[PDB]
Enzyme design. Structure first.
Site, PDB file in Angstrom:
ATOM      1  N   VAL A  19      55.128  41.457  36.663  1.00 59.22           N
ATOM      2  CA  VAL A  19      54.048  41.007  37.523  1.00 59.22           C
ATOM      3  C   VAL A  19      54.104  39.522  37.847  1.00 59.22           C
ATOM      4  CG1 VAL A  19      52.475  42.846  36.821  1.00 59.22           C
ATOM      5  CG2 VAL A  19      52.483  40.674  35.547  1.00 59.22           C
TER       6      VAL A  19
ATOM      7  N   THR B 163      47.468  48.330  18.146  1.00 57.74           N
ATOM      8  CA  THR B 163      48.573  48.473  19.105  1.00 57.74           C
ATOM      9  C   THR B 163      49.843  47.856  18.549  1.00 57.74           C
ATOM     10  OG1 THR B 163      48.392  46.350  20.243  1.00 57.74           O
ATOM     11  CG2 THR B 163      46.877  48.076  20.924  1.00 57.74           C
TER      12      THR B 163
ATOM     13  N   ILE C  81      47.670  49.382  24.789  1.00 64.79           N
ATOM     14  CA  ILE C  81      46.482  49.675  25.581  1.00 64.79           C
ATOM     15  C   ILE C  81      46.880  50.274  26.919  1.00 64.79           C
ATOM     16  CG2 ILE C  81      44.560  48.635  26.846  1.00 64.79           C
ATOM     17  CD1 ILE C  81      44.393  46.600  24.406  1.00 64.79           C
TER      18      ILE C  81
ATOM     19  N   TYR D 119      45.355  31.181  25.260  1.00 62.75           N
ATOM     20  CA  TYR D 119      45.050  32.591  25.471  1.00 62.75           C
ATOM     21  C   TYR D 119      43.603  32.773  25.870  1.00 62.75           C
ATOM     22  CZ  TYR D 119      44.579  37.613  24.586  1.00 62.75           C
ATOM     23  OH  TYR D 119      44.313  38.971  24.652  1.00 62.75           O
TER      24      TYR D 119
END
Ligand SMILES: NC(=O)c1ccc[n+]([C@@H]2O[C@H](COP(=O)([O-])OP(=O)(O)OC[C@H]3O[C@@H](n4cnc5c(N)ncnc54)[C@H](O)[C@@H]3O)[C@@H](O)[C@H]2O)c1
EC number: 1.1.1.122
Length: 257
Positions: A60, A186, A18, A151
């Protein structure tokens, strides 16, 4: 393209999937794009491929990496108009009793706190540019999913946090929005399917979870992101569903006893 010309965009997790779809969409719209990713393979090749995109190796979850990401974006390009927080991970299916608090904490670090950290460091610059934040959440934050308690919880947090930050930054003209994809074809999808007994069947099931009868493409998420950055100037705190109608209607999910 000219829809987002002269603008500077950071995309985390931008090296494949993505993220790479979002990078391409923004380059095609005339923007300069900083690809942030923790793996070198995909992001470095994308930088060679796309005039207008550059790659910065960045995790990150490491605040120093994120500080450097922002400071290098400003040093090299002189402004910052949009942050797309796409970095995230979807573990394989886990029964609730098979999860752990520590695994949950680690997934919060990736999916929620990395988004928080980069947004915070970017916002002084986004205020100067009247820029915007786009978080990539998931439809399962809204409606749930089996075998993914951690999640789902992280994506529920991202979607809620989007709305809270939108309230906070509205007086400063900074918009904050999220995209909630459903099933997007993906490398993460293909890998998760490969662990399953019959991968072909798992993929077939994934296509039919959508009334449109197919999974979505990274390019379709990318277009939604470019819309939110460049033309959605009265949208803040919205959750843009890119799901092929997965949330609609009744389905197979399992006379009155
Ligand atoms: N694929 C789907 O069906 C789907 C559905 C809903 C939401 N999403 C969300 O979309 C996003 C992208 O998912 P995808 O399917 O493209 O995954 P992917 O695994 O194919 O790609 C994710 C990218 O992020 C990078 N990344 C991972 N951890 C990172 C970190 N700590 N710092 C920086 N980069 C990091 C990876 O290296 C990779 O390039 C995630 O937030 C995911 O939860 C995906």
């Amino acid at each position: 393209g000219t829809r987002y010309a002269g603008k500077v965009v950071v995309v985390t997790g931008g090296g494949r999937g993505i993220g790479a779809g979002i990078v391409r969409a923004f380059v095609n719209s005339g923007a300069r794009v900083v690809i942030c990713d923790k793996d070198e393979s995909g992001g470095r090749a994308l930088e060679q491929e796309l005039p207008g995109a550059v790659f910065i190796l960045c995790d990150v979850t490491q605040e120093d990496d994120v500080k450097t990401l922002v400071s290098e974006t400003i040093r090299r390009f002189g402004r910052l108009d949009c942050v797309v927080n796409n970095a995230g991970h979807a573990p394989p299916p886990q029964r609730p009793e098979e999860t752990s608090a520590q695994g949950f904490r680690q997934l919060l670090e990736l999916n929620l706190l990395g988004t928080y950290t980069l947004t915070k460091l970017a916002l002084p610059y986004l205020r100067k540019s009247q820029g915007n934040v786009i978080n990539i959440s998931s439809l399962v934050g809204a409606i749930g999913q089996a075998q993914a308690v951690p999640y789902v919880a992280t994506k529920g947090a991202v979607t809620a946090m989007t709305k809270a930050l939108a309230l906070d930054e509205s007086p400063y003209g900074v918009r904050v929005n999220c995209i909630s994809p459903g099933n997007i074809w993906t490398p993460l999808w293909e890998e998760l399917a490969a662990l399953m007994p019959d991968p072909r069947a798992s993929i077939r099931e994934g296509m039919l979870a959508q009334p449109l009868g197919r999974m979505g493409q990274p390019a379709e998420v990318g277009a939604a992101a470019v819309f939110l950055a460049s033309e959605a100037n009265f949208c803040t705190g919205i959750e843009l569903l890119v799901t092929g109608g997965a949330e609609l209607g009744y389905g197979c999910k399992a006379p009155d006893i």
